[PDB]
């Protein structure tokens, strides 16, 4: 009994989304390492790497599970979505044989073919899901999903021999043969499904924007009963000032904002580019590795211009911010690999509208007193210290922040690195939900059929029979949700902005022709859809 | 057991990322984006940052002058201080294999603020040698990690060479030239991952968490 | 229900190792004898031989069952491994048809094909397993295992007619048609498994090195209470000497070493080579047959040089020693058959570190008294007898020795020849475990499909349809093991040396490129891994 | 019943290490304070201190509990050691004059 699965079901409790897509297994070569030496002149760093004949299914995004309309209803009626479960089923396996002839390529069923699939419930192989690498089902059903090959990075002893750093691999090099593991041989007419359930421990990710500025919550009517020290006068007077309720910037507050990198966003107009936005490394010029979204901050802020409420607001993209690259939708001969070093035009930028818990901000202590009169001219040296602008405002004990919202393309989960102690790891900087035990990587490969054996004559094994498998991939995921409790207010509350396409056409639809009749162009919004829809009092 | 993988390289070297990091702005507001390939380990945006780090110099100063104290939170310009020596969980000393033909004796780098167990005298008679004062100790056990660490030894928070930040670029409100790229003490952020120091064979087994109102990760001394 | 089997499981009691490999059955010709006449000028000796259309599976090595890492953990945590069981399962049988055309070779499934497999539980066919002949699964999964053809040697009446000896075969010639025996026809979608259990009588083979020199075990403090006769003085004085405890060489001992051949190892530098190392034969020059590892001794000893503790120790290879030939790992067009007479460069030499129960030794009675004064000048003749150096120190009643350790490539079992009386046969000189009833030879052959029958016209049967079978071969083996009881000692005990590759790269890993980009080179240690890891008091 | 205790026992679950050592109690003086004044020129900082006639037993190290070989096997076969318990017994007290 194979049934095509699809459609979503909303309930008050739970959201159940189901897709099915024809998938393909290319024949992947045998285990091959990919060793790319690093260079200190560039930013390259040595990777030992491995490539595997196996291929896995990466279903991890919201965009995969929620149809755009299903993502719309998600926000309208709900708040606090948390993922509950994930099923994946391979079914309708059919394995073609590609026979290359001078006549031509003739594909024909192989009644004898098979595929071999298994999942890691033991997490015993390098867990490659959740790093936001583009292997996903195309947004369009009817766009075949060709399963990504599986590979994994491993490190050796990494030495700086010269301008170029190389890994000699005399340690810590691992070779995982997935061949050696219990897997389930499948063949035409076999159904393999793997059900999985996220921890109950996952946090509820709010779908709604905080109402109030963090630092302005109080009664504008009364004066405070506290007196902040403004500064000293008349040599030791230490004048005190009692802030009125209205004074929002000046009122002492119980709870500080979360951390901030206070990075420049389009404040540098200079044509020069940062090699890397934020990188914790210990080479003056020798090397580095980025920590890009090092904090939970808007990657890009709307920041409405003021020229008569300019129609196109200036969108500020913070260095270290991240934008989802728009995939090519059934796009033929536009691959345009000739653009190198991965320059990407017009990515989805995840622009927040500055409904943030706290306005975008950059200076830890910004003030203009003049000298601090401790370390005032300089400390013990020529070094002029305790400079007022301090980058990276740090996390203090009393503190409050919200992580990034859920973009429609946001990754759903990721694997909290297996490590002794971790801190707020449940909120990944880059995505939805850190999980200790994630959805297993489901490894699939064509059962290899070798060619005719030689009578021990030339000792070169004939290449495997060229063949490929195509199958339905059922993947259903259940989300726990809570219907929104509307703030009880007398105002109609302006909805989150409906998506906008550069084209001006409706988003997530097939446009007839963009300078072609041939194929329709599926249109995605100019910017990343953000799951934050309605205010809620903080 | 030692962690296998570099923190920042865990992913499939085969695919390109589906994210685009902003590399920098061009042509006055172009804001060029770059999609890192899977292989690019340093350049790939990551969900989980390293733990804190003091980025202290280890044998990079060759100067015969010595630090009175390695790390000390105190509020006297010259009046007083008290050390916080192993202020973070970091290798106290890293092996850091030399490269001269894979030199047989690797240069062991001892981070200031690192700590080494003093070798006790084993039934050692009349070698007490108290005449050496101020507790100068020769050849202590240095707890040298081999740099199998979760993340390689590292020192700069934001290290880059753009030129001016073009916020507080020449200076802030003053002559003070601010937001200097090298920031010491890379701080603990909300998403973060680290491992505490391993268990040396001489490592103390327990300690008493000070009786105090609120403590943070006190279970790992 | 066919499931791919793999992975190992360690327990305190038992080790269970499982592999699965795509296998192939070539079409082997009909029964053909191979008769090679012998020559007395050379060492050749006549063999009647037989070749069979059948093919068998030889799974016998440790390297097959234990993944290198699984062999590592074997030593770290265990001692005394003994083999418990062996399962073999053929499954996922698929039988291609090779159609040769002027167009080209087109393989296509044959829904009608079959294979015919059976096992000898009666040992009624010549048992060919366990002689260390290279038919084994390649170390790399993904290296197809093409089952070896089956053949057997038989002897006739062997006469020296001339310089060349020939077997006339007027006796003792046997013809085994495996066709005539009960076997199980298999076809696409059939599962055939054969479970087997070693005797309980097998000895525990220690994985740990003896601590103490055999001849030095005693209290260094006391003097002995025995007096050895050193020699006679003053014409009949017969001076006696009481050895002190420290004197290890001179102290009389209850238990002698095992046998020894005291063979020269690299002491001959001469370019001349031994035709055969050790051969019990009765032809002055007419003929011989080797007994190569005639005793349990180190085949090769490390024997550390002294030049400032020279980094590369001089490895001494005892004549009659044996070394495992390194197989070519997915190695293409390096077959290099042009090297003839089987000259092999750089085999795995099974080098012991001289942790032996007794140091390497060569002289039975070595002494320099001068004449024995029995048979002193000569015996009854010119022959000068009872020469002090006696080769082949013999096994005496009180005696103690250890057999060779278990190399990672060591064969697991062998069949004790069916014979009236045998002596210590349970320890094969060359390998792991002699067994009375070994794992059955599992004979497999393609079910033969003849070509179109002629209308009795040319009376030459059309060749069989060219076809070959490929299938999964599950082979699981269980080992009984005992966790090590650590010698209770205050010292950390230096581990057995980790493997070393000539390349310097980590052993048992895929190296990217050796002067090629094309395929990775799987790297095996310079010398045979030895299963002896930690000392234990003897 | 006084028995000399020693030796370690490894199990899959738990590691049990035992040592026994002849110990001595010196006669320690009465309560004495040690007051060392601090100096800003140096790094010295004032400590009031106290010294007690009492003496305590500090058993706290891994090296104390794990014999080097017992520490070796610890690593070879195990991971994730956490301390479970600690017993201390004074016995065979004999007091010289």
Residue numbers in the entry:
A (entry chain M), C (entry chain c): 15 to 552
B (entry chain b): 222 to 442
D (entry chain b): 15 to 111
Provide text from the study.
Aleutian mink disease virus (AMDV), a pathogen in minks, and human parvovirus 4 (PARV4), infecting humans, are parvoviruses belonging to the genera Amdoparvovirus and Tetraparvovirus, respectively. Despite low amino acid sequence identities (10–30%) both viruses share the icosahedral nature of parvovirus capsids, with 60 viral proteins (VPs) assembling the capsid via two-, three-, and five-fold symmetry VP-related interactions, but display major structural variabilities in the surface loops when the capsid structures are superposed onto other parvoviruses. The viral capsids are critical components of the viral infectious life cycle: they protect the viral genome, are the determinants of the tissue type and host that is targeted (tropism), and remain intact while the virus escapes the endo-/lysosomal pathway and trafficks to the nucleus where the genome is released, leading to viral genome replication. The VP monomers of PARV4 and AMDV conserve the β-barrel core motif (βB–βI) with the additional βA strand and the α-helix A (αA) observed in other parvoviruses.
Three-dimensional-image reconstruction of the PARV4 capsids, utilizing a total of 5248 individual particles, resulted in a resolution of 3.12 Å, based on an FSC threshold of 0.143. The reconstructed capsid of PARV4, the first structure of the genus Tetraparvovirus, displayed familiar surface features, similar to those observed in the capsids of other genera in the Parvovirinae subfamily, with channels at the icosahedral five-fold axes, protrusions near the three-fold axes, and depressions at the two-fold axes and surrounding the five-fold axes. This results in very small depressions at the two-fold axes and more segmented depressions surrounding the five-fold channel. While most viruses of the Parvovirinae subfamily possess three separated protrusions surrounding the three-fold symmetry axis, in PARV4, density near the three-fold axis fuses the three-fold protrusions in the shape of a concaved triangle. Structural order in the density map of the PARV4 VP started at lysine 15 (VP2 numbering). The amino acids in the VP monomer were generally well-ordered to the C-terminal leucine 552, with the exception of aa 380–401, located near the three-fold symmetry axis, where only diffuse electron density was observed at a sigma (σ) threshold of ~1, preventing reliable placement of the amino acid chain. The PARV4 capsid utilizes VR-II to form the five-fold channel; VR-I, VR-III, and VR-IX for the two-/five-fold wall; and VR-IV, VR-V, and VR-VIII for the three-fold protrusions. The fused three-fold protrusions are caused by VR-VIII with its subloop leading towards the three-fold symmetry axis.
